[PDB]
């Protein structure tokens, strides 16, 4: 299935090649709707991600749903960061579990095409 093992290797294979100026120029439809400068700090944030996924025991990665308050104190202490950042990293991983299970069920073309860019009313940004 999809774990923080494959997420570990996803983000450590993606911390080699990952950049925000090379990947905000490889899509013309998503850099015109949401702002082109909301991309990322790739080295900071992917070395953060790899740090936080190094702070985990291996069945905490292969079974991400058993991570609770004490586990996040221990992870946030391990790499020298805030419990909230580990919260939002397990958030990001949750979204990617959503997306790759959706890519598992739906054929690659019907889950990459039905992908939607979204605003709260037709007026720009609000």
């Amino acid at each position: 299935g999809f774990d923080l093992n494959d997420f570990l290797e996803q983000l450590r294979q993606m911390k080699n090649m990952g950049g925000x100026x090379x990947x905000x120029x490889x899509x013309x439809x998503x850099x015109x709707x949401x702002x082109x400068x909301x991309x990322x700090x790739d080295d900071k944030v992917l070395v953060r991600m790899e740090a936080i996924i190094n702070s985990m025991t291996m069945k905490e990665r292969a079974k991400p749903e058993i991570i609770k308050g004490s586990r996040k104190r221990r992870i946030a202490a391990g790499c020298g960061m805030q419990v909230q950042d580990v919260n939002r990293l397990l958030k990001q991983f949750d979204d990617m579990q959503r997306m790759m299970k959706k890519m598992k069920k739906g054929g690659x073309x019907x889950x990459x095409x039905x992908x939607x860019x979204x605003x709260x009313x037709x007026x720009x940004x609000x």
Partner: peptide
């Protein structure tokens, strides 16, 4: 390929606007 471009594109990017 196709699953590496569908990996990386919406990974880097859909981690950006969300």
């Amino acid at each position: 390929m196709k699953q590496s471009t569908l990996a990386l594109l919406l990974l880097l990017l859909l981690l950006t606007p969300v």
